[PDB]
Scaffold this active site. Structure first.
Site, PDB file in Angstrom:
ATOM      1  N   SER A 154     -39.586 -27.083 -17.894  1.00  0.00           N
ATOM      2  CA  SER A 154     -39.623 -25.856 -18.691  1.00  0.00           C
ATOM      3  C   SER A 154     -38.731 -25.844 -19.918  1.00  0.00           C
ATOM      4  O   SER A 154     -38.817 -24.888 -20.687  1.00  0.00           O
ATOM      5  CB  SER A 154     -39.323 -24.629 -17.841  1.00  0.00           C
ATOM      6  OG  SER A 154     -40.400 -24.468 -16.930  1.00  0.00           O
ATOM      7  N   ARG A 212     -32.049 -22.688 -21.849  1.00  0.00           N
ATOM      8  CA  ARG A 212     -33.392 -22.807 -21.257  1.00  0.00           C
ATOM      9  C   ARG A 212     -33.313 -23.953 -20.272  1.00  0.00           C
ATOM     10  O   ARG A 212     -32.846 -25.039 -20.622  1.00  0.00           O
ATOM     11  CB  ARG A 212     -34.434 -23.125 -22.347  1.00  0.00           C
ATOM     12  CG  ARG A 212     -35.836 -23.452 -21.819  1.00  0.00           C
ATOM     13  CD  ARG A 212     -36.804 -22.281 -21.769  1.00  0.00           C
ATOM     14  NE  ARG A 212     -36.362 -21.100 -21.025  1.00  0.00           N
ATOM     15  CZ  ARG A 212     -36.417 -20.968 -19.704  1.00  0.00           C
ATOM     16  NH1 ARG A 212     -36.734 -22.009 -18.931  1.00  0.00           N
ATOM     17  NH2 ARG A 212     -36.116 -19.808 -19.138  1.00  0.00           N
ATOM     18  N   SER A 213     -33.797 -23.718 -19.046  1.00  0.00           N
ATOM     19  CA  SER A 213     -33.733 -24.766 -18.032  1.00  0.00           C
ATOM     20  C   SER A 213     -35.123 -25.196 -17.609  1.00  0.00           C
ATOM     21  O   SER A 213     -36.119 -24.645 -18.088  1.00  0.00           O
ATOM     22  CB  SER A 213     -32.941 -24.257 -16.828  1.00  0.00           C
ATOM     23  OG  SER A 213     -33.484 -23.041 -16.344  1.00  0.00           O
ATOM     24  N   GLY A 214     -35.171 -26.179 -16.707  1.00  0.00           N
ATOM     25  CA  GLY A 214     -36.424 -26.618 -16.115  1.00  0.00           C
ATOM     26  C   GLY A 214     -36.180 -27.329 -14.808  1.00  0.00           C
ATOM     27  O   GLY A 214     -35.065 -27.787 -14.528  1.00  0.00           O
TER      28      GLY A 214
END
Length: 263
Positions: A42, A206-208
């Site tokens: 993501s 923002r992570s994923g």
């Protein structure tokens, strides 16, 4: 020494860890596997939303453009879009959902409106990122197969690209302000860098998460009197649970942020 610590942590996980830091106050840069590929997961959402904003800036996409959500198109993890079957949503609102809640249907809607994964890759090349590539939609891009170059980036490329988006002219002032607010308003990454961020610091992130025990984060941190620090932390090819991956990102964040305790 951070290098030795990360190599020991990496040996415990039996996976690969990639880190990059660019401190624009001191102009210091440091990395661990900074030019190796890791899955975007993501963390691509920032890049799809930057592409969309750049198309709005250029006059190629209306700020009020909309698209219809159809029930049959809703993919896994769509906490915002799954309430909208049959309704028209602004593409800008889809980016808000992708950035705040990591909504996958919202991200796919943005990708479909801007020309797809190919268009995000072309935007990245246009702003000087020669490494990052987006190839598939959600959720297939979470595959994270070792050696597969599809849907990958490097820790250094994400740091360099985030700096270009925030401080260069890739986006208009209005657009960079919007992208920054969306990243500051991220609601799904409290267990990661945010969990160990020192007092007085602001964060846009923002992570994923991906298959093959993958997890990552791209962040920009700053203070009233401290110029932005850009950070990438990526982990892949482990057998860690999602909870253990969250703990590992917070652990690496702590090692980097301890340097900043008096900054």
């Amino acid at each position: 020494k951070l290098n030795e610590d990360i190599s020991l942590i990496e040996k415990q996980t039996s996976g690969r860890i990639g880190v990059s830091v660019w401190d624009t106050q001191t102009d210091e840069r440091w990395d661990y596997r900074g030019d190796e590929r890791f899955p975007l997961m993501s963390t691509f959402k920032t890049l799809a939303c930057a592409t969309m904003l750049s198309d709005m800036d250029s006059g190629k996409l209306n700020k009020n453009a909309t698209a219809r959500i159809d029930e049959r198109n809703i993919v896994v993890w769509s906490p915002v879009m799954d309430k909208l079957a049959g309704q028209s949503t602004r593409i800008e609102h889809a980016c808000e959902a992708a950035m705040l809640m990591s909504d996958n249907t919202a991200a796919n809607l943005v990708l479909n409106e801007i020309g797809g994964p190919k268009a995000v890759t072309l935007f990245l090349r246009s702003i000087g990122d020669k490494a990052t590539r987006l190839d598939r939609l959600e959720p297939r891009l979470n595959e994270a197969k070792p050696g597969d170059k599809r849907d990958t980036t490097t820790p250094n490329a994400m740091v360099n690209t985030l700096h270009t988006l925030m401080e260069d002219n890739a986006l208009s002032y209005e657009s960079r302000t919007q992208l920054k607010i969306w990243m500051q308003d991220n609601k799904v990454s409290d267990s990661l860098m945010r969990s160990v961020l020192p007092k007085g610091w602001s964060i846009a992130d923002r992570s994923g998460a991906g298959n093959y025990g993958s997890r990552g984060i791209s962040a920009m941190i700053w203070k009233d009197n401290y110029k932005p620090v850009y950070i990438s932390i990526y982990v892949t090819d482990t057998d860690l649970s999602l909870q253990a991956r969250d703990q590992l990102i917070a652990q690496i964040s702590q090692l980097i942020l301890e340097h900043y305790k008096e900054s």
